[PDB]
């Protein structure tokens, strides 16, 4: 319906837990539409999930901290 300012992604498969940051949960989702339509990525969010979930990625962030420490 014209609306294309955000491409929703449906969970295709769950990876598991992440923790560290705070009981994080990484899951893989695929683009339902938006040119690409068919792009699987790995988004990290807090809380569980269930195959079917849908969420738009207005940015998806990145967070390229890259701890200089590196030990």
Swiss-Prot record:
<dbReference type="GO" id="GO:0030490">
    <property type="term" value="P:maturation of SSU-rRNA"/>
</dbReference>
<keyword id="KW-0687">Ribonucleoprotein</keyword>
<comment type="similarity">
    <text>Belongs to the eukaryotic ribosomal protein eS28 family.</text>
</comment>
<dbReference type="GO" id="GO:0003735">
    <property type="term" value="F:structural constituent of ribosome"/>
</dbReference>
<protein>
    <recommendedName>
        <fullName>Small ribosomal subunit protein eS28</fullName>
    </recommendedName>
</protein>
<dbReference type="GO" id="GO:0000028">
    <property type="term" value="P:ribosomal small subunit assembly"/>
</dbReference>
<dbReference type="Pfam" id="PF01200">
    <property type="entry name" value="Ribosomal_S28e"/>
</dbReference>
<dbReference type="GO" id="GO:0022627">
    <property type="term" value="C:cytosolic small ribosomal subunit"/>
</dbReference>
<keyword id="KW-0689">Ribosomal protein</keyword>
<dbReference type="InterPro" id="IPR000289">
    <property type="entry name" value="Ribosomal_eS28"/>
</dbReference>
<dbReference type="GO" id="GO:0006412">
    <property type="term" value="P:translation"/>
</dbReference>
<dbReference type="InterPro" id="IPR028626">
    <property type="entry name" value="Ribosomal_eS28_CS"/>
</dbReference>
<dbReference type="InterPro" id="IPR012340">
    <property type="entry name" value="NA-bd_OB-fold"/>
</dbReference>
């Amino acid at each position: 319906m014209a609306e294309d300012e955000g491409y929703p992604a449906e969970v295709i498969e769950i990876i598991g837990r992440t923790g560290t940051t705070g009981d994080v949960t990484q899951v893989k989702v695929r683009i339902l539409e938006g040119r690409d339509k068919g792009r699987v990525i790995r988004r990290n969010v807090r809380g569980p999930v269930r195959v079917g979930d849908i969420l738009i990625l207005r940015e998806t962030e990145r967070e390229a901290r890259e701890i200089k420490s590196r030990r």
